[model samples]
Target: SAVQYFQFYGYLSQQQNMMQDYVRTGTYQRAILQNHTDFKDKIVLDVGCGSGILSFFAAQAGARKIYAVEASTMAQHAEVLVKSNNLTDRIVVIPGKVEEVSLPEQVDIIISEPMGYMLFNERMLESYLHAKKYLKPSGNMFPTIGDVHLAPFTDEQLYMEQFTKANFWYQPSFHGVDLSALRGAAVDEYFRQPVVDTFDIRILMAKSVKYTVNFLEAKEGDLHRIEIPFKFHMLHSGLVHGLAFWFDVAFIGSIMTVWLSTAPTEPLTHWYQVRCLFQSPLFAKAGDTLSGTCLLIANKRQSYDISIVAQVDQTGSKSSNLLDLKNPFFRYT
Candidate 1:
């Protein structure tokens, strides 16, 4: 059931890509290495330890003991890798969910790479939260804080691409007859979901922080509902096609803090970016104000449903329209 609902098998199929990205980028690895003081002689727990990479990092940092918890079949390979690296004595491979697995004692540090598209798509952070009780009062989490950001972007190319794709069904004549009846349905489906892709940084008008989370003090209920109100002044005049979403995750240590941002300006990661396109683009001028609210609600499946409603007023003319993003069609990942 986990495999089907969470697409765990798909993740396993692309193990090389994921591992390569993490190793090559060195985002998580660098954070752990820089915070070696925290791992020195400390008990560490690696939640969702895919290939025991984080566990190895902890061991290399001189962790007294490490618990590498994984719920997928990849745990077998992790065990092999642990043995081959001669880390079996220090890093114990636990082939089960962190919530179900038993640790000998509470850990002094909890490390994980649980971020997904938009920060909470895969809902892996829920497991990390569940394991928090097993953490000592002064224990630290690798990525202790996260923030989601949203900004208005102008991209006529993407808008045109979607428009053409949706209107293809409504051409004057398919073969000899009109198929305009399908245009409505095609348009609705095409604009229903947000697109996940990279975009040029120059398209952004102004970015705003939607919300922030502190894992060290986070609660399960805190993840259920979030409402963020934002007001932005346009840096330049252009067609506002949609809102762009990304996140910044921070690994805070007593001696150092490292940030890994998925913003368009930052180095690209596996989680590119989330773009929620409006059915109809908004026209705004320089110095205009765009104000809106972003709503996030956790569903029964543990994933979040995202919705953004925005309104903008020109210099003199007061014209506004609401873009409803409540449709279930728009998912995080």
Candidate 2:
């Protein structure tokens, strides 16, 4: 049943995708390997240590002892890997949620790969925050900042493809049945589910730094919802399709400079940019501005109810190409 639940939750392909993502895997390796001094002889805790990859890296970097915690049956595989690696004594695999797990000693470093899509998907941030109590006062956190980004996307072809896929129920005739009356419902459902995919960087307008979470100062309430008032500047006149969501991580030891971004411009990760498509396209010109308040309410674990109240201010002459969507209805880890 545990295995079934994991697979049913979409971990089968997701597990493979994460390990195969070069940028995601490589950045993590470098984050541990490049700063070996910090890890040398330090007690480390790995939150959501799936397959215990991060635990392995810390061991390789000479950690004194590592507490590897996983919430799923996947934790068993880590124990097996640690046993085979002949470092079972140094790395301890605890198959439990981070909040419920007990550690013998406080940790000097809490290493985590906890940022899901849109930075808060899967509610993994809660685990990351919960583990903070076990960390020493002067301890460090790998990938110190979870930086969230929102960018405007413009491409009629791409947006049309997605719009049509969702609005397919509006067909004139399918199997001698008419479903044309459900066009409104189909389009609404289309915009509700944030399409998870990557797009051409050239089609993106400009990135807006909406919300940045510094783990050191994070509160539990911060995990409930995010209120980001954003202002995006366009480069040219086109049908502003929608906004794209992506995130990056910064590993700060106050000395080692490590950064990884899953932005449209950067190499894709399993958590590819999530496109929060709009119902109607906003017509605008060069150097125009689009401003809005984006709300991300955690409807259920790993599923969010998102609302982006958008408006575009026409450039200079005030022509009639502007579009405003205040009632706009609102990925993978």
Candidate 3:
């Protein structure tokens, strides 16, 4: 299991794709360069330094020394890349988890690209938080802020497709033989998990800001449990399938701040978008209100158990219908 987990993330293709995206946009590079003054004559740490890309950025920004820490086998490749770039003297590629590795001294700045689906699914933020202890009291963290946003959405085609797939096995006959016995199992499996995919922003009726976190002051307990209440005023009358979630990160530098948003309006990243589908759709009018509570609780094995309870109230209506759902745990490898 451990080997399988590492293989999923240790492959070169995965790291190269992420590196290509970061380089293509220069969002991260620009953020580092904007704060070049801080890197000069300073020691830095790069957590989960896949291929040492961020470490290279720090070196170019004139950092005196850097500790590039990675847990997967890719760390060996990072070392080779560092040497080929003739930065072996300045960048040290360490192959170990940040929590278990030892740094020679407290760093002046810590840099990492640790976001996953909805900003918290991968749980790498915990690793970054753990390594913060190795930072100086005056140290700063790149991509200092992260915010998760939610919006009520409607997609008739998607909802129908999912329903069809789940009910396909329940057909009265398959090849002239009865196959209705599997319907219960099929529904349980299909509706028990949240689908991770890119969605059309046009389907959004209304959006609400769920929560934001400042890494500099974030506590470990904060990730354990988070609850956000939202009331979205519908702008269009349609069949609401569920809520969609996305996040944005900000790199606050002395010179200027850079933002990388995974919103549908912005260029899509690898962490495309997260959609939490409802078992049954909701009906509402343009002026109706959709109220809900989103809960995220971390599990014991570095995963998260998510649950959302929502309801729609029609204009001048006295009752509402529940769209509550509890999704399976999401593990970050």
Candidate 4:
């Protein structure tokens, strides 16, 4: 059962693909070529270096030494790729999790594609923090910062349609009592669920002041909120099946950028998987108005204890009732 669950949700390879896609989708290759003139003698550490893709890029950029870390069989695959490219002398593939791997020398620059969906699911930020301690005092951290955004939307018909489906789902069991009997129960669940507000974010290089997040200086209960006033593409036109989000992280010195994402219809990212965690699980339809607010705050000081609160509102109905949701979904250690 456990193994099945892991495979069902296991998406390490999916993450690898997303990392590759991120590099392909952005100005990554160009940036690497233009900015890494000193790569010839510099030592680079590629955290979560799946399949040695980034390691090869580092070598091509002229990195003298490279350490590629992968916690899965992908590390062995990376070894073959590295040797085939004749980069074996320059790039070393380490088959183990970053937390357990040890290096013989301090890195000059740390490179990684650690961005996850919704920006925080894989806990790569924390791993990077640990990796940072291994760097020389003057060493640099790529993707020095990141941020999350939220917004509200309205789609009445969206709700009615979903509500109708919910009604039908219950009708078979209830023997045809007016489906309206379940309206209150359905709406309550819908409002309580922490619906995705649009997990949109940007990654900034160490040199960019826009990378304003300070994970180290973060307090146990600090809350951050940013509101985005646009609509993401719709994967499904009826009711929103799930939240869609993407991530961008930078290997500053190499000028390499990595992004991972999932839309309303696709699967979740390792960083932030799709969460149906709502106070209420009800249906929503098109044309229904949805106003949303997302809150992220540190909850625990150490260990897995933290609070995340998300509240959404619906504005089409004549009544003043607004959908209120709160989820404590983060822990600190």
Candidate 5:
């Protein structure tokens, strides 16, 4: 029954391409060899081994034993790769999820590219923390560090377009005409509005959730508030489409990165974006403050459900008094 709902999307296609690209380019291989030379006689664990590229690299790096763990059909394919490379003796392909499988020995290093969109998307940290308990006392983690970043930009046209789409069918009779055609025009009007503020943040191990008592012990009933202050750079006007944020994490074993952008990556493997919505758009001018607080409270009894309450405040004055609203189409009212 579980398999019935297990739909196969483009997951395999992307995985295959990533492996091919990595191996064909040999970029990741070279990086790992330079940083982890101790793999020569050490046992290394590769979680979500995929096509076993990292496992292969671990083997080529001279690892005496490599446990290549994978939970998909990709494992079956990687078996062929291990044998073809004559690495079967050094690398063992384990076809099971990381949590369910047990390794024969504690490993000297744990290597994985388990990051997801916005850093927390795939919930990879849980697996990594679990694996840590089975690692050697002095073992190393592949991605030893990470940071999150945010920026503010004027994409008023984008926001207005989203608003129009959301409001279209629900409120079509407002202007006695279908407003779908005005989506683009509405976006252009909003685009002329000035940007008020740009808020950014860099999330790292120390300040982020990694080792912090607040994050580690963050339980189901915790109510945490995060505030980001934004001070406008330009003449204060523009609709906030949403926050476009990303992370830079060091897998430590190498310089490779798991980059996710607002732009599409290989046709819908996943969308790496988070939307912070406002009950109503607030208009402001230069020197104004876009102060906000996000309240995060986990569901009382559910481990997976969490609630976020956001309250955004904008304080400023309108720059132009010439704009009228009676005309409707050209009005800013």
Candidate 6:
């Protein structure tokens, strides 16, 4: 069953998307290659080591030994890479779940590209966390921390496009049928899903806040559900149409730290931003705040159910009423 779960990652074309992400790939390369003293002669463990690039990076950095753990069939490809590079003795391509594999010795460093969309996609961090038992007490983790940032945004153009699509059923007549009857249902169906997308940085109408999780301090149980409480101060008077989400990961090194971000302000990466539009728009003036909680509940299908609840206390000059706007139960896969 787990074999089928990772079947998609068995192909080279699928792996190319991530390997070609210079920001993602270069950061890992720099994190190890730049910090020679830390990686040199150290035993490294690369969890979810797709294509074994991280293991190769470790070997090139002078790691004494590398255990590359990959659950997907990509491990076989990595085996070929190990033979091609003539690093058979130094880098071991272990083709099994990291949870089931046995390592003879503790490693001095743990590395993984376990982050997913919105920072918890595929729930791969659980496997990365489980591999910690094989790490020495003083061992370090590459990409020590991950942070998912949330912000209120005001993009009239984007919202109108969404509105037009969602309210398409509001037509007076379509082929002799009254489509107006289905307008409510269509709108609800459309806005109830959190869309994976990108937007202009200028569309952000408020200050962004982050919910951070660090590999050094996080427990395995912490992967189940994430509750992010945020307060976004309105940077300009505009209609808050939705919330924008982006993530940042830090590759911690003794010599230097490298960071990779998928924010609108940063270079584009495979993991773009997630935008969840509210069912009802809330108006706010400059200096007003939208405070609330965003919950990401892990589902049985290896995805998340995203729910958002926000409160606009003072409303603003635009709307006199206090709004407790909520966008509930959207899939975040």
Residues forming the 10-long window of minimal summed lDDT in candidate 1: 317-326
lDDT of 1 at 21: 72
Ranking by TM-score: 3, 6, 1, 2, 5, 4
Q: Residue 225 of candidate 6: its Cα lDDT?
A: 79
Whole-model lDDT for model 4 versus the true structure?
A: 0.48
Residues 169-281 of candidate 5 have per-residue lDDT tens digits of 44466678665666556543443332222223221111111212122223312222223333333234454333334454444443343332222112222323333322244
lDDT of 3 by residue, 27-65 (tens): 888889888987888999999998888999999999999
lDDT of 6 by residue, 1-333 (tens): 345559978888978989998988988898889988878999999998889999999888999999998888899999999999999999998888898999989999998998876677677888888889998997888879988899988877766765688677987877877889888877776676566666679988887898888897788889787888887778898888878889998888898888889998998787778777776778888987788888877766555777787777686322111111122222223
Question: Model 2 Cα RMSD, Å?
Answer: 4.7
Model 4 C-alpha lDDT per residue in residues 1-333, reported as the tens digit of each score: 323322322355654555556434344444444557535678988887766666777687788999887776667777888899888889998877677888888887776665544555444556666676557766765544454432222344434444554555365346755566676687555543333333322210011111234433333133222233333332222333323233444334434443322332224333342233332222334333333323333223211211223222342322212222223222110
Off by over 4 Å in 2: 1-14, 171-173, 314-333
> All candidates' lDDT scores?
0.78, 0.75, 0.79, 0.48, 0.49, 0.81
lDDT of 1: 0.78
Q: Give lDDT tens digits, candidate 2, residues 1-333.
A: 334434433354555667788898888999888899989988999998878888999998999899998877778777888999999889998878787878888999999888766677667787788899998997888878888888777777766765677667877888988888988777665566666667778887775655789887787668787788887777777777777778888888645969989887787777777777766778777778877777777654354567777778663322111111212222232
The model with the greater TM-score, 1 or 3, is 3
Candidate 3 error regions (>4 Å) = 1-3, 22-25, 175-177, 300-302, 313-333
Model 4: which ten-residue window has the lowest total lDDT?
202-211
**How many clashes would you count in candidate 4?**
32
**Tens-place lDDT digits, model 1, residues 147-241:** 88989888898777776888888876889778888887887676766677777889898755567889998986677777777878888898888
Select the stronger candidate by lDDT from 4 and 5: 5
**Per-residue lDDT for 315 in model 6?**
60
Query: Going through the candidates in order, what is the number of backbone clashes in each?
Result: 0, 0, 0, 32, 9, 0
Task: Name the lDDT value of residue 38 in candidate 3.
Answer: 72
Candidate of highest lDDT: 6
How do all models score by TM-score?
Answer: 0.89, 0.88, 0.90, 0.59, 0.62, 0.90
